[PDB]
Coordinates of C-alpha atoms in Angstrom, one line a residue:
Chain A
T1 CA 4.9 7.2 10.1
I2 CA 8.2 8.8 8.8
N3 CA 10.6 6.5 10.7
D4 CA 10.9 4.5 7.5
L5 CA 12.7 6.9 5.1
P6 CA 15.3 5.6 2.6
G7 CA 18.9 6.3 3.5
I8 CA 18.1 8.6 6.5
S9 CA 19.8 9.1 9.9
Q10 CA 18.1 8.7 13.2
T11 CA 19.4 12.0 14.4
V12 CA 17.6 13.9 11.7
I13 CA 14.4 11.9 12.1
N14 CA 14.2 13.3 15.6
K15 CA 14.9 16.9 14.5
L16 CA 12.2 16.3 11.9
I17 CA 9.6 15.4 14.4
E18 CA 10.7 18.1 16.7
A19 CA 10.2 20.7 14.0
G20 CA 6.7 19.5 13.8
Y21 CA 6.9 17.2 10.7
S22 CA 5.2 14.1 11.9
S23 CA 3.7 12.5 8.8
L24 CA 5.2 12.1 5.3
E25 CA 2.5 14.2 3.9
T26 CA 3.5 17.3 5.9
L27 CA 7.1 16.8 4.6
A28 CA 5.8 16.3 1.1
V29 CA 4.0 19.6 0.7
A30 CA 7.1 21.3 2.3
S31 CA 9.7 23.6 0.8
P32 CA 13.3 22.5 1.1
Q33 CA 14.4 25.9 2.5
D34 CA 11.5 25.8 5.0
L35 CA 12.3 22.3 6.3
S36 CA 16.0 23.1 6.2
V37 CA 15.8 26.2 8.3
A38 CA 13.2 24.6 10.6
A39 CA 15.4 21.7 11.8
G40 CA 19.0 22.3 11.0
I41 CA 19.3 19.7 8.2
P42 CA 21.5 20.8 5.3
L43 CA 19.7 22.1 2.3
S44 CA 20.7 18.9 0.4
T45 CA 19.3 16.8 3.2
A46 CA 16.1 18.8 3.5
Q47 CA 15.2 18.3 -0.2
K48 CA 16.2 14.6 -0.2
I49 CA 13.7 14.0 2.5
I50 CA 11.0 16.0 0.7
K51 CA 11.7 14.0 -2.5
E52 CA 11.5 10.7 -0.8
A53 CA 8.4 11.9 1.1
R54 CA 6.6 12.2 -2.2
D55 CA 7.8 8.9 -3.8
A56 CA 5.9 7.1 -1.1
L57 CA 2.7 9.2 -1.4
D58 CA 2.8 9.9 -5.1
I59 CA 2.9 7.6 -8.2
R60 CA 6.3 7.1 -9.8
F61 CA 7.3 4.8 -12.6
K62 CA 10.4 2.7 -11.9
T63 CA 12.3 1.2 -14.8
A64 CA 12.3 -2.4 -16.0
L65 CA 16.0 -2.3 -15.1
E66 CA 15.6 -1.4 -11.4
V67 CA 12.9 -4.0 -11.4
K68 CA 15.3 -6.7 -12.5
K69 CA 17.7 -5.6 -9.8
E70 CA 15.1 -5.9 -7.0
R71 CA 13.4 -9.1 -8.2
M72 CA 16.7 -10.9 -8.1
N73 CA 17.9 -9.0 -5.1
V74 CA 15.4 -10.0 -2.4
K75 CA 12.9 -12.9 -2.6
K76 CA 9.3 -13.4 -1.6
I77 CA 6.8 -16.2 -1.4
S78 CA 3.6 -16.0 -3.4
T79 CA 0.2 -16.3 -1.6
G80 CA -1.6 -17.9 -4.5
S81 CA -3.5 -14.8 -5.2
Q82 CA -2.0 -12.5 -7.8
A83 CA -4.0 -9.6 -6.4
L84 CA -2.6 -10.1 -2.9
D85 CA 0.9 -10.7 -4.3
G86 CA 0.6 -7.2 -5.6
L87 CA -0.5 -5.7 -2.3
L88 CA 2.7 -7.4 -1.0
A89 CA 5.0 -6.1 -3.8
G90 CA 5.5 -9.8 -4.8
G91 CA 4.5 -11.7 -1.6
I92 CA 5.7 -12.7 1.8
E93 CA 9.3 -11.7 2.2
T94 CA 12.2 -13.4 4.1
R95 CA 14.2 -11.5 6.7
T96 CA 10.9 -10.1 7.8
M97 CA 7.8 -10.9 9.9
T98 CA 4.5 -10.4 8.2
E99 CA 1.3 -10.5 10.3
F100 CA -2.2 -11.2 9.2
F101 CA -4.8 -10.2 11.8
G102 CA -8.5 -10.4 11.2
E103 CA -11.7 -11.9 12.6
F104 CA -12.2 -15.6 12.6
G105 CA -12.2 -17.1 9.1
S106 CA -10.9 -13.9 7.6
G107 CA -8.4 -15.9 5.6
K108 CA -5.6 -16.0 8.2
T109 CA -5.3 -19.8 8.6
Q110 CA -5.8 -20.9 5.0
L111 CA -3.1 -18.4 4.1
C112 CA -0.7 -19.9 6.6
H113 CA -1.4 -23.3 5.1
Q114 CA -1.2 -22.0 1.6
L115 CA 2.3 -20.5 2.4
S116 CA 3.6 -23.7 4.0
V117 CA 2.9 -25.3 0.7
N118 CA 3.8 -22.4 -1.8
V119 CA 7.1 -22.0 0.0
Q120 CA 8.1 -25.4 -1.5
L121 CA 7.6 -24.3 -5.1
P122 CA 10.6 -23.0 -7.0
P123 CA 11.4 -19.3 -7.5
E124 CA 9.8 -19.6 -10.9
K125 CA 6.5 -20.2 -9.3
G126 CA 6.7 -17.8 -6.3
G127 CA 8.5 -20.3 -4.1
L128 CA 11.9 -20.5 -2.4
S129 CA 12.3 -24.2 -2.8
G130 CA 12.3 -24.7 0.9
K131 CA 10.5 -26.0 4.0
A132 CA 8.1 -24.4 6.4
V133 CA 7.6 -24.9 10.1
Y134 CA 4.0 -24.5 11.4
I135 CA 3.6 -23.7 15.1
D136 CA 0.0 -24.8 16.0
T137 CA -1.0 -22.7 19.0
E138 CA -4.7 -23.3 19.2
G139 CA -4.8 -26.6 17.2
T140 CA -5.7 -25.1 13.8
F141 CA -3.6 -27.2 11.5
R142 CA -5.6 -29.4 9.1
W143 CA -3.9 -31.8 6.8
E144 CA -7.1 -32.1 4.8
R145 CA -6.3 -28.5 3.8
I146 CA -2.6 -29.1 2.8
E147 CA -3.7 -32.1 0.7
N148 CA -6.3 -30.0 -1.2
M149 CA -3.8 -27.2 -1.8
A150 CA -1.1 -29.7 -2.8
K151 CA -3.6 -31.5 -5.1
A152 CA -4.4 -28.2 -6.8
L153 CA -0.7 -27.7 -7.4
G154 CA -0.5 -31.3 -8.6
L155 CA 2.2 -32.1 -6.0
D156 CA 3.1 -35.3 -4.0
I157 CA 0.8 -34.9 -1.0
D158 CA 3.0 -37.1 1.2
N159 CA 6.1 -35.3 0.2
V160 CA 4.6 -31.9 0.7
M161 CA 3.4 -32.9 4.2
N162 CA 6.9 -34.1 4.9
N163 CA 8.4 -30.7 4.1
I164 CA 6.3 -29.0 6.8
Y165 CA 7.9 -29.3 10.2
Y166 CA 4.8 -29.3 12.6
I167 CA 4.5 -28.8 16.3
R168 CA 2.0 -27.9 19.0
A169 CA 2.7 -25.1 21.5
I170 CA 0.2 -25.7 24.3
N171 CA 1.0 -22.7 26.7
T172 CA 3.2 -19.6 26.5
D173 CA 6.3 -21.2 28.0
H174 CA 6.2 -23.9 25.3
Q175 CA 5.5 -21.2 22.7
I176 CA 8.5 -19.2 24.0
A177 CA 10.7 -22.3 24.2
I178 CA 9.8 -23.9 20.8
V179 CA 10.7 -20.6 19.3
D180 CA 14.0 -20.5 21.3
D181 CA 14.7 -23.9 19.6
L182 CA 14.2 -22.6 16.1
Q183 CA 17.8 -21.4 16.0
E184 CA 19.0 -25.0 16.4
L185 CA 16.3 -26.4 14.1
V186 CA 17.3 -24.2 11.2
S187 CA 21.0 -24.9 11.8
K188 CA 20.3 -28.6 11.4
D189 CA 18.0 -28.2 8.4
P190 CA 18.9 -25.1 6.3
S191 CA 16.1 -25.9 3.8
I192 CA 13.7 -24.2 6.1
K193 CA 12.6 -20.8 4.8
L194 CA 9.3 -20.3 6.5
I195 CA 8.1 -20.1 10.1
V196 CA 4.4 -20.0 10.9
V197 CA 2.9 -19.2 14.2
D198 CA -0.9 -19.3 14.2
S199 CA -2.5 -17.2 17.0
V200 CA 0.7 -16.0 18.6
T201 CA -1.2 -13.7 21.1
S202 CA -3.6 -16.5 22.0
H203 CA -1.8 -18.1 25.0
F204 CA -0.6 -14.8 26.2
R205 CA -4.2 -13.5 26.4
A206 CA -5.4 -16.7 28.0
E207 CA -2.7 -16.7 30.7
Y208 CA -2.5 -12.9 31.4
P209 CA -6.1 -11.9 30.8
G210 CA -7.5 -8.4 31.5
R211 CA -6.0 -5.0 31.6
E212 CA -4.9 -5.9 35.1
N213 CA -2.3 -7.8 32.9
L214 CA -2.5 -6.0 29.6
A215 CA 0.9 -4.4 30.5
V216 CA 3.3 -7.3 30.9
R217 CA 1.3 -9.2 28.2
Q218 CA 2.3 -7.0 25.3
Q219 CA 5.6 -6.9 27.1
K220 CA 6.4 -10.7 27.2
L221 CA 4.5 -10.8 23.9
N222 CA 6.8 -8.2 22.3
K223 CA 9.9 -10.1 23.5
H224 CA 8.5 -13.1 21.8
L225 CA 7.9 -11.3 18.5
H226 CA 11.5 -9.9 18.6
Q227 CA 12.9 -13.4 19.1
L228 CA 11.0 -14.2 15.9
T229 CA 12.1 -11.1 14.0
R230 CA 15.8 -11.5 14.9
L231 CA 15.6 -15.1 13.6
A232 CA 14.0 -14.0 10.3
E233 CA 16.7 -11.4 10.0
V234 CA 19.7 -13.6 10.8
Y235 CA 18.7 -16.7 8.8
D236 CA 17.1 -14.9 5.9
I237 CA 13.8 -16.6 6.3
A238 CA 10.2 -15.5 6.3
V239 CA 8.1 -15.3 9.5
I240 CA 4.4 -15.2 9.5
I241 CA 2.1 -14.7 12.4
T242 CA -1.6 -14.5 12.8
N243 CA -3.4 -12.5 15.5
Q244 CA -7.1 -12.9 15.9
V245 CA -9.1 -9.7 16.5
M246 CA -12.7 -8.4 15.9
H247 CA 4.4 -2.0 17.9
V248 CA 6.8 -4.7 16.6
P249 CA 8.0 -4.0 13.0
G250 CA 7.4 -6.0 9.9
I251 CA 4.3 -5.9 7.8
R252 CA 0.8 -5.9 9.3
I253 CA -2.0 -6.8 7.1
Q254 CA -5.7 -6.8 7.9
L255 CA -7.9 -9.5 6.5
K256 CA -11.7 -9.1 6.4
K257 CA -14.8 -10.8 5.1
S258 CA -16.9 -10.1 2.1
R259 CA -19.8 -12.2 0.7
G260 CA -19.1 -15.8 1.5
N261 CA -16.2 -16.8 -0.7
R262 CA -14.5 -13.3 -0.9
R263 CA -12.0 -11.7 1.5
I264 CA -10.4 -8.2 1.7
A265 CA -6.7 -7.5 2.2
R266 CA -5.4 -4.1 3.4
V267 CA -2.0 -2.8 4.4
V268 CA -1.9 -1.3 8.0
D269 CA 1.8 -0.9 9.0
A270 CA 4.5 -1.2 6.3
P271 CA 7.2 1.0 4.8
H272 CA 8.1 -0.3 1.4
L273 CA 4.4 -1.3 0.8
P274 CA 1.7 0.9 -0.9
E275 CA -1.4 1.4 1.1
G276 CA -4.8 0.5 -0.5
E277 CA -6.8 -2.7 -0.5
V278 CA -7.4 -5.7 -2.8
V279 CA -9.8 -8.6 -2.9
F280 CA -9.0 -12.3 -3.1
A281 CA -10.8 -15.7 -2.5
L282 CA -10.7 -18.8 -0.4
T283 CA -11.4 -21.8 -2.8
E284 CA -10.9 -25.5 -2.6
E285 CA -7.5 -25.2 -4.1
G286 CA -6.7 -22.5 -1.6
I287 CA -5.8 -18.8 -1.5
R288 CA -6.6 -17.7 -5.0
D289 CA -8.1 -14.8 -7.0
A290 CA -11.8 -13.8 -7.4
Chain B
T1 CA -18.2 -10.4 -40.8
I2 CA -20.5 -11.9 -43.5
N3 CA -23.7 -10.8 -41.8
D4 CA -23.0 -7.5 -43.5
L5 CA -22.9 -9.0 -46.9
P6 CA -24.2 -7.3 -50.2
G7 CA -27.9 -8.0 -50.9
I8 CA -28.2 -11.3 -49.1
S9 CA -31.2 -13.1 -47.4
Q10 CA -30.5 -13.7 -43.8
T11 CA -31.9 -17.1 -44.3
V12 CA -28.9 -18.0 -46.3
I13 CA -26.3 -16.2 -44.2
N14 CA -27.4 -18.9 -41.8
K15 CA -26.9 -21.8 -44.1
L16 CA -23.4 -20.5 -44.6
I17 CA -22.4 -20.1 -41.0
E18 CA -24.3 -23.3 -40.6
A19 CA -22.0 -25.1 -43.1
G20 CA -19.2 -23.4 -41.3
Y21 CA -18.3 -20.6 -43.7
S22 CA -18.1 -18.0 -40.9
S23 CA -15.1 -15.9 -42.1
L24 CA -15.2 -14.0 -45.4
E25 CA -11.7 -15.0 -46.5
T26 CA -12.8 -18.6 -46.6
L27 CA -15.8 -17.8 -48.8
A28 CA -13.7 -15.7 -51.1
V29 CA -11.6 -18.7 -52.0
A30 CA -14.4 -21.3 -52.4
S31 CA -15.9 -23.2 -55.3
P32 CA -19.4 -22.3 -56.6
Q33 CA -20.2 -26.0 -57.1
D34 CA -18.5 -27.0 -53.8
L35 CA -20.3 -24.3 -51.9
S36 CA -23.6 -24.9 -53.6
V37 CA -23.6 -28.5 -52.4
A38 CA -22.6 -27.4 -48.9
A39 CA -25.5 -25.1 -48.0
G40 CA -27.9 -26.2 -50.7
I41 CA -27.7 -22.6 -51.9
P42 CA -28.0 -22.4 -55.7
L43 CA -24.9 -22.0 -57.9
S44 CA -26.3 -18.7 -59.0
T45 CA -26.3 -17.3 -55.5
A46 CA -23.2 -19.3 -54.4
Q47 CA -21.2 -17.6 -57.1
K48 CA -22.9 -14.2 -56.3
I49 CA -21.5 -14.5 -52.7
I50 CA -18.0 -15.8 -53.5
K51 CA -17.5 -12.8 -55.7
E52 CA -18.9 -10.5 -53.0
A53 CA -16.7 -12.3 -50.5
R54 CA -13.7 -11.2 -52.4
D55 CA -14.5 -7.6 -53.2
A56 CA -14.9 -7.4 -49.4
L57 CA -11.3 -7.9 -48.2
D58 CA -10.7 -6.0 -51.5
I59 CA -7.1 -6.6 -52.5
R60 CA -5.2 -3.7 -54.0
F61 CA -2.1 -4.0 -56.2
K62 CA 0.3 -1.1 -55.5
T63 CA 3.8 -0.7 -56.9
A64 CA 6.9 -1.5 -54.9
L65 CA 7.5 2.3 -55.1
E66 CA 4.1 3.2 -53.6
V67 CA 4.5 0.8 -50.8
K68 CA 8.1 2.0 -50.0
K69 CA 6.5 5.5 -49.7
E70 CA 3.7 4.5 -47.4
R71 CA 5.9 2.3 -45.3
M72 CA 7.9 5.4 -44.4
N73 CA 4.9 7.8 -44.5
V74 CA 3.6 5.9 -41.5
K75 CA 5.8 4.4 -38.8
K76 CA 4.4 1.2 -37.2
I77 CA 5.8 -1.1 -34.6
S78 CA 6.5 -4.6 -36.0
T79 CA 5.8 -7.6 -33.8
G80 CA 8.5 -10.1 -34.8
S81 CA 6.0 -12.1 -36.7
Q82 CA 5.7 -10.8 -40.3
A83 CA 2.4 -12.6 -40.5
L84 CA 1.0 -10.8 -37.5
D85 CA 2.6 -7.6 -39.1
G86 CA 0.6 -8.4 -42.2
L87 CA -2.6 -8.8 -40.3
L88 CA -1.9 -5.4 -38.8
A89 CA -0.7 -4.0 -42.2
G90 CA 2.7 -3.1 -40.9
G91 CA 2.4 -3.2 -37.2
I92 CA 0.8 -1.4 -34.2
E93 CA -0.1 2.1 -35.1
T94 CA 0.4 5.3 -33.1
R95 CA -2.5 7.6 -32.2
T96 CA -4.6 4.5 -31.7
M97 CA -5.5 1.9 -29.1
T98 CA -5.1 -1.8 -29.9
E99 CA -6.7 -4.6 -28.0
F100 CA -5.5 -8.2 -27.9
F101 CA -7.8 -10.5 -26.0
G102 CA -8.1 -14.2 -25.4
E103 CA -7.6 -17.0 -22.9
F104 CA -4.7 -17.2 -20.5
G105 CA -1.7 -18.0 -22.7
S106 CA -3.1 -16.6 -25.9
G107 CA 0.1 -14.7 -26.4
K108 CA -1.4 -11.3 -25.5
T109 CA 1.2 -11.0 -22.7
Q110 CA 4.4 -12.1 -24.5
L111 CA 3.2 -10.0 -27.4
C112 CA 3.3 -7.1 -24.9
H113 CA 6.9 -7.7 -23.9
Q114 CA 7.8 -8.1 -27.5
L115 CA 6.4 -4.8 -28.3
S116 CA 8.1 -3.1 -25.3
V117 CA 11.4 -4.3 -26.9
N118 CA 10.8 -3.6 -30.6
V119 CA 9.5 0.0 -30.0
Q120 CA 13.1 0.8 -29.0
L121 CA 14.6 -0.1 -32.4
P122 CA 14.7 2.4 -35.3
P123 CA 12.1 2.4 -38.2
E124 CA 14.3 0.4 -40.5
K125 CA 14.5 -2.4 -38.0
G126 CA 10.7 -2.2 -37.2
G127 CA 10.7 0.3 -34.3
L128 CA 10.1 3.9 -33.6
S129 CA 13.2 4.6 -31.5
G130 CA 10.9 5.1 -28.6
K131 CA 10.4 4.1 -25.0
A132 CA 7.7 1.8 -23.5
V133 CA 5.6 2.0 -20.4
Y134 CA 4.4 -1.4 -19.1
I135 CA 1.4 -1.2 -16.7
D136 CA 1.4 -4.5 -14.7
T137 CA -2.1 -5.3 -13.6
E138 CA -1.9 -8.9 -12.5
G139 CA 1.8 -9.4 -12.2
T140 CA 2.4 -10.6 -15.7
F141 CA 5.6 -8.7 -16.3
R142 CA 8.8 -10.8 -16.4
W143 CA 12.3 -9.4 -16.8
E144 CA 13.9 -12.7 -18.0
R145 CA 11.7 -12.3 -21.1
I146 CA 12.6 -8.7 -21.9
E147 CA 16.0 -10.2 -21.7
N148 CA 15.7 -13.2 -24.1
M149 CA 14.0 -10.8 -26.5
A150 CA 16.8 -8.2 -26.1
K151 CA 19.2 -11.1 -26.6
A152 CA 17.6 -12.6 -29.7
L153 CA 17.5 -9.1 -31.3
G154 CA 21.1 -8.6 -30.2
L155 CA 20.3 -5.5 -28.1
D156 CA 22.1 -4.2 -25.0
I157 CA 20.0 -6.1 -22.4
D158 CA 20.8 -3.4 -19.8
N159 CA 19.9 -0.5 -22.1
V160 CA 16.6 -2.2 -23.3
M161 CA 15.5 -2.7 -19.7
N162 CA 16.2 0.9 -19.0
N163 CA 13.9 2.1 -21.8
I164 CA 10.8 0.4 -20.3
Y165 CA 8.9 2.3 -17.5
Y166 CA 7.3 -0.1 -15.2
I167 CA 4.6 -0.1 -12.6
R168 CA 2.1 -2.5 -11.0
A169 CA -1.6 -1.6 -10.5
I170 CA -2.7 -3.4 -7.3
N171 CA -6.3 -2.4 -7.8
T172 CA -8.8 -0.2 -9.9
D173 CA -8.4 3.1 -8.0
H174 CA -4.7 2.7 -8.5
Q175 CA -4.9 1.6 -12.1
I176 CA -7.0 4.6 -12.7
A177 CA -4.7 7.1 -10.9
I178 CA -1.7 5.7 -12.8
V179 CA -3.3 6.4 -16.2
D180 CA -4.1 9.9 -15.0
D181 CA -0.4 10.5 -14.3
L182 CA 0.3 8.8 -17.6
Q183 CA -0.4 12.2 -19.2
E184 CA 2.2 14.0 -17.1
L185 CA 4.8 11.2 -17.8
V186 CA 4.9 11.6 -21.6
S187 CA 5.3 15.3 -21.3
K188 CA 8.2 14.6 -18.9
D189 CA 9.6 12.1 -21.4
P190 CA 8.5 12.5 -25.0
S191 CA 10.8 9.6 -26.0
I192 CA 7.9 7.3 -25.0
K193 CA 5.9 6.1 -28.0
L194 CA 4.3 2.9 -26.5
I195 CA 2.0 2.3 -23.5
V196 CA 0.8 -1.1 -22.4
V197 CA -1.8 -2.0 -19.9
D198 CA -2.0 -5.8 -19.3
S199 CA -5.6 -7.0 -18.6
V200 CA -7.3 -3.6 -18.2
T201 CA -10.4 -5.1 -16.9
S202 CA -8.9 -7.5 -14.3
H203 CA -9.5 -5.3 -11.3
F204 CA -12.8 -4.1 -12.6
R205 CA -14.2 -7.5 -12.9
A206 CA -13.0 -8.6 -9.5
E207 CA -13.8 -5.5 -7.5
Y208 CA -17.3 -5.0 -9.0
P209 CA -18.6 -8.6 -8.6
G210 CA -21.6 -9.9 -10.4
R211 CA -23.6 -7.1 -11.9
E212 CA -24.2 -4.5 -9.3
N213 CA -22.2 -1.2 -9.0
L214 CA -22.0 -1.7 -12.8
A215 CA -23.4 1.7 -12.8
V216 CA -19.9 2.9 -12.2
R217 CA -17.7 -0.1 -13.2
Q218 CA -18.8 0.9 -16.6
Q219 CA -18.9 4.6 -16.1
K220 CA -15.4 4.3 -14.6
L221 CA -14.0 1.9 -17.2
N222 CA -15.1 4.2 -20.1
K223 CA -13.5 7.3 -18.8
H224 CA -10.5 5.1 -18.2
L225 CA -10.3 3.7 -21.7
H226 CA -11.2 7.0 -23.5
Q227 CA -8.6 8.6 -21.4
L228 CA -6.0 6.2 -22.8
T229 CA -7.3 6.9 -26.3
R230 CA -6.9 10.6 -26.0
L231 CA -3.4 10.0 -24.8
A232 CA -2.5 8.1 -27.9
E233 CA -4.2 10.6 -30.3
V234 CA -2.8 13.7 -28.7
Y235 CA 0.8 12.5 -28.1
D236 CA 1.4 10.5 -31.2
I237 CA 1.8 7.4 -29.1
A238 CA 0.8 3.8 -29.6
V239 CA -1.4 2.4 -26.9
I240 CA -1.9 -1.4 -26.1
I241 CA -4.4 -3.0 -23.8
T242 CA -4.8 -6.7 -23.3
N243 CA -7.7 -8.5 -21.8
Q244 CA -8.1 -12.0 -20.5
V245 CA -11.3 -13.9 -21.4
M246 CA -12.4 -17.5 -21.4
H247 CA -17.1 0.2 -28.0
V248 CA -13.9 2.4 -27.9
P249 CA -10.9 0.2 -28.8
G250 CA -9.5 1.2 -32.2
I251 CA -8.2 -2.3 -33.0
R252 CA -9.4 -5.5 -31.4
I253 CA -7.3 -8.6 -32.1
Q254 CA -8.5 -11.9 -30.8
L255 CA -5.9 -14.5 -30.0
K256 CA -6.3 -18.2 -29.6
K257 CA -4.2 -21.3 -29.0
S258 CA -3.3 -24.2 -31.3
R259 CA -0.7 -26.9 -30.6
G260 CA 1.1 -25.7 -27.5
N261 CA 3.4 -23.3 -29.6
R262 CA 1.3 -21.9 -32.4
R263 CA -1.3 -19.2 -31.8
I264 CA -3.9 -17.7 -34.1
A265 CA -4.7 -14.0 -34.4
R266 CA -7.9 -12.7 -35.9
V267 CA -9.1 -9.2 -36.7
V268 CA -12.2 -9.0 -34.6
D269 CA -12.7 -5.4 -35.5
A270 CA -10.7 -2.5 -36.8
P271 CA -11.7 -0.1 -39.6
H272 CA -8.8 -0.1 -42.0
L273 CA -7.2 -3.6 -41.4
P274 CA -8.4 -6.4 -43.7
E275 CA -10.6 -8.9 -41.8
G276 CA -9.2 -12.5 -41.7
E277 CA -6.7 -14.4 -39.6
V278 CA -3.2 -15.6 -39.4
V279 CA -1.0 -17.9 -37.3
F280 CA 2.2 -17.1 -35.4
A281 CA 4.3 -18.6 -32.7
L282 CA 5.8 -18.1 -29.2
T283 CA 9.5 -18.9 -29.2
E284 CA 12.3 -18.4 -26.7
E285 CA 13.4 -15.6 -28.9
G286 CA 10.0 -13.9 -28.8
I287 CA 7.0 -13.6 -31.1
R288 CA 7.9 -15.0 -34.5
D289 CA 6.3 -16.9 -37.2
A290 CA 5.7 -20.7 -37.4

């Protein structure tokens, strides 16, 4: 869980794990001299790691200055829930693939829809003034939902629906291919800033079912995810995937159910993001607060 | 505020609030014959209450010499609105918690940035030459604001944004843990004279739905608010908490809206401070008068 340390070499990371320092919490409670003599690492390097080890575990107060730097440095998309935006240090981020996995109805879909709409807002409103691309794997798209979310944001339905490139991926090959053709699609239309793949694992599970296949599944399935990650990294766009459930980087968020209207959000895998969970709701207007 | 009026039959206190004479300041400046014929209440009694309505907000005439003493004797943070400053008899005090509450847009938030910028100025300019710590609860912070405010006050934008410690509280457990560390922070940096928690109860209301674990939402909130109050009292620091709404808090100022720009402030409670209300405005420069 330490592979994500600010300004750190890969060589040392190894030496760190070798020495026996697996988690960031072991490094945290460590003494510079100790970690230094137990893995080569110059004394200056030993303490830099320890410092950064804490910053992730402990609470530190940045300054409104650094904040301005970051805010205008990278850019994110708002989910519609202030609570969730927080869990996501602002929201869905470009140049990175964020995944929402959770049981059926956990929020996954509505959130994909919400983002295909919110991405069109302006930076002032948690948007990036751009278009989305929804890749309907199991046939989950619902315009009745886009309309309601557009309505809530008092936007031109028609127009909002025209800013969402849509497409059905019926089997893995088509899923693999459509994605292959995203490079071209974005080149032709640079206003695209969001790629959405609902149920990415879906066909891969259907076609290569069982453990008798589990191997080459995650395999072909990881090559797919990389194709997506590379695209988000090269075109500076956000990629969102959903995986339905009861090692490919990017944020992984778990959605869960609470009493009827409410849902729980929790950070699983993610470097720059603070662990902990927050609640939000699924209303008629869409992904919003409780 | 009139319920607690000198020797008065509750039956009449009704006829008053029933005529609309809620606030004491309005009674104080009313006509015994215009009031008598408003709540039927006799002239004898009418007069007897208008006179008692004045002694209430009891006005004291000091010499310009007295006031120049007291103004220095006690350093308060101005708000940009001399009317609001008046309502607060100078400004926000240190070693005390002040609460602004009202509907989204009441000003409570901008008034927070305003303060995070004015605390930096020196006493003569309305500040305390201190630093501010902004605790973002629902993502209300905005740097473009701390900018326009630094601009209007002709400050060094960069240096103003460097004197504000910032941090977002994704949930209650976190909010709570940040305030615990708040103690250690002011020891670390004594230059801090202002703390601001925007929407203290946001997460509490949302994570403790309906009225259930209220056992602790309340137990927890108290220890959380008292905690902040010690902070202020022990470290000669001014503490500010906002609260959005459609027993501890030193001062409680309610804010309300008027025509899209003007906002009303009213002393809902606070020992010293003279009950009554005033009107200010939200400008591109910041919090000013109208």
